[model samples]
Target: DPEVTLLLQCPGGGLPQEQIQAELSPAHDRRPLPGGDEAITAIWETRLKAQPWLFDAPKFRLHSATLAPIGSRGPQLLLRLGLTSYRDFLGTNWSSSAAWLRQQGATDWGDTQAYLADPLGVGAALATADDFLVFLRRSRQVAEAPGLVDVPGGHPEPQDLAGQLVVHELFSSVLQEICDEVNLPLLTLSQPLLLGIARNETSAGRASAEFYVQCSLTSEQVRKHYLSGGPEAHESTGIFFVETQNVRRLPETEMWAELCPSAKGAIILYNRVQGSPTGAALGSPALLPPL
Candidate 1:
């Protein structure tokens, strides 16, 4: 539980993409690292030696987020994204001295994550038309949470940083992630609703945007589509679907122990978002008991 925690959520129903705001400023990039650069490069070199396929890529550093809701419109997120790299994240956040970095960061930077590359990731809590929630058993071949259960997710690429799509990628990337990871057609999915954002605090407060999406396909259809494999299918080896009725009691099961940090964080947000009296009445398909 220490590894993951809910950071923000929509008070009632999930908000549409138009309501969310994106603030992209390079000013928010990683802080001065007089000593970190050397350490990061050294650690990165070691990983590259072991796994020759590892390559650095541009990732948005999630500086901070604001839950701003307007009258009648419901909850929305205002995200401030800077820039970071995968190499920086591994050297700092995944380093053996990660806690020490945070300890020294608190005194020097006044903020713990300032000294860490906290890239913003996006995850989806997809619901099947037959009233099931989707999860995947990750492949050990990938980085982080290998051989564990994880929600579909990936980072917002830097190409969006140019004066192009810019901030919108944060939302759309999750949609793309599900489409590829699940091998589903985008047409079968409803536009994603922003359920909330959760942070992997144990990993230096690495945060991810978790959205809820409804699919027109049944669990059987999804299974068939997934079995065909996707471009990113190598990231996960198999799939798991829980009956909507069983979602709330999920944590009590042994399967909960297998959930990756982000998946656990995503479920926590799902429960809080749809568990409330108002949150429950929001027609979140996954919250409904099977008819």
Candidate 2:
């Protein structure tokens, strides 16, 4: 297993947190919490018991930025999204947050939606070689988006903050997640063919960002590794290796309806880069497969 320390250690030494935060641009996108410190503490405490795996860890208030495309140069230019909990970036939401606190038998806040925009960040990998590496989320006592087929990735963690700074840590985090989840080595995969960002707009004040990377890997190798005690065996319900051509043939309706926005954005960007028709690129059959 990759040691967590490998993530925290910088090349020379740890840079000052303030220096890093300044570059990352931490700010308040939303107004202060209605309940103030009490509310923040209440929410954190509620979540701590529910998810000790998260609360037990040392977390930093971090900033994540969006990616941009620069023609042949691929995705570039990452801009910050203010400061949000490293915990929230791991997929915690105000809904569950409030509900958990409420379930704790307290009526103090009464299921407030005030922190709905607390902000969550994600880093996903769309791995491709002869086929695309995709997997289905397994049903478990504690699982989000169960049954949804998506690429391998997770939120950017403090450990991912090693070596230089800036949002590029998004890439390192995604690499770490893939390795941790699937026993896949980042070194084997090619440089990200595409690196960009997308927004999942909701009623949460403004919006949020989802960062993704596209890389190449062999289907057979991934399958063999995945079946041989990869973390997916426990975390995923099933794994599938789809032909690239077949991927281009999948229905858009299904993708839009079922695929996570991050997965959808990755596929769309993949097709666009390959120069497929809007229909075929989005998986419509009208274009017809090659003979």
Candidate 3:
């Protein structure tokens, strides 16, 4: 729990893609650092030297979200987004002065993550028809969270026509990652259920919106597909699936140590949605009465 923070969650069954909305504005960008970008630029360059593969790109910076009535309709989830870049995220969130930056922002602007990029991430809890959930062991060559297990996910980019972003792009990006990383066809997956969003405490409060996705294939078939490789297969070195009904116990056990905060947050969200009030889950209940 220390590694993840639940920013917001929906009731059981999660919100559909249509209900989740976004409003992007340049005004939501990160506040400038008090000491200036000199120290951070040097830090960013040092990282690039060590990992030349890393590239800079535009990302949606999530300022915050809330559910409330705006016009004639009832309460609806609306996300307030700005623009940021991978370069700024690495320089600020991953900076050694990250802690100091957060504290400094609180003193100067009254917001901790305000001065940081806070780029929004998207994660998918991809589940097979056989009732299993998919996971990937990140490749060591990656920029962040190498070696930690994670769900197939990535950031929604502004590269779509270079015009204003549609809220659907954020929802569709998760499916793209599933197809790109799991090596599965997008058509095999169901429309995503926007479960909720969580923050990775390990990455200066980096946030991700977690979605519940249902796939038509079985776990074995999916694993077979994974080995054949996808466009982003290099992002992960291994793939595995667990009984979706039994996943609740993962966080309650030592195996939780193997997952990154983003993954942990996703599992926690899934468990909350599927579990009974007692805790975790006891597998799915039978349709008929128990003997």
Candidate 4:
């Protein structure tokens, strides 16, 4: 017997998995939230929980993910919307920075090697404090290399795959993508992907994982491969290269605007690229995936 999406389903609630697979496409676009007043109210409530900052700052945030609280064409959701950025702050100066390293007078080494040497350990440590920034792509349109990325690109939707945690897999997935796209590599557990603890928890219910990704290639090499994201990322349809200081120079978006998470992410990346110390001390600000 084939599966189907029953009319009497709730969010995250559904018929048996077997039935659902046989009947409906897994993508949220295929099985949109069941429409009605109840559905709308349910979504509004979820939005509030995800973004309480909205209460303090009432604004509409737009997201590219297919599944949202309200229907696409329906009334706006009053959520505090902002962009997500990834950054690496390996060796930036913060007032609270450890003097042990500064005493060494090692100006050449930024916060890259330690992370590459031991990501899990460093990441665990950074969790105690703010994570540094590493990499980010913006939400704005660029004439070059459009659609080639989703800031902190290659994230997988949360679902247990092959009996393993989906988030972990997504981390590896992004690593592979970076490698394949630019000949970078995620080799050896000793040099696991370097990530920082969750920062600020910008959006509730959605956990953020930010990391300082170590790459074998130089900045020039990265720029070479950053073409448009092709078809997979039509909305995230641009790619470009700039240093960090230039990124910080970008004007802040006005409140109540619908911006892409990647836009903020790009600034984070540029900050690290330009050798900013404050951002470096904190570690990378994470780009989140659906929990």
Best by lDDT: 3
lDDT score, residue 228, model 1? Answer: 79
List the global CA lDDT of all models.
Answer: 0.79, 0.45, 0.81, 0.28
Instruction: Name model 1 segments beyond 4 Å from true.
Output: 34-36, 69-75, 141-143, 160-164, 230-233, 279-291
In order of appearance, the predictions have TM-scores of 0.88, 0.62, 0.87, 0.31
Distance from true location, Cα of 19 in model 3, Å: 1.3
- Which 10 successive residues of model 3 have the least lDDT summed? 282-291
Which residue pairs in model 1 clash with each other? Answer: none
Ranking by TM-score: 1, 3, 2, 4
Question: Candidate 1, overall lDDT?
Answer: 0.79
Clashes of each: 0, 1, 0, 40
Better of 1 and 2 by TM-score: 1
Q: Model 4, which residues run further than 4 Å from truth?
A: 1-150, 157-170, 177-205, 228-236, 245-259, 262-291
lDDT of 3 by residue, 219-271 (tens): 99998889877545547888888886568678676678889999988898887
Model 1 over residues 108-134: C-alpha lDDT tens digits? 888788778998888888889998999
**Runs with alpha carbons beyond 4 Å of true place in candidate 2:** 1-22, 28-30, 49-76, 86-92, 96-120, 159-164, 201-217, 230-234, 249-256, 274-291
RMSD of 2: 10.2
lDDT of 4: 0.28
Q: Report the Cα RMSD per candidate.
A: 3.7, 10.2, 4.1, 22.4
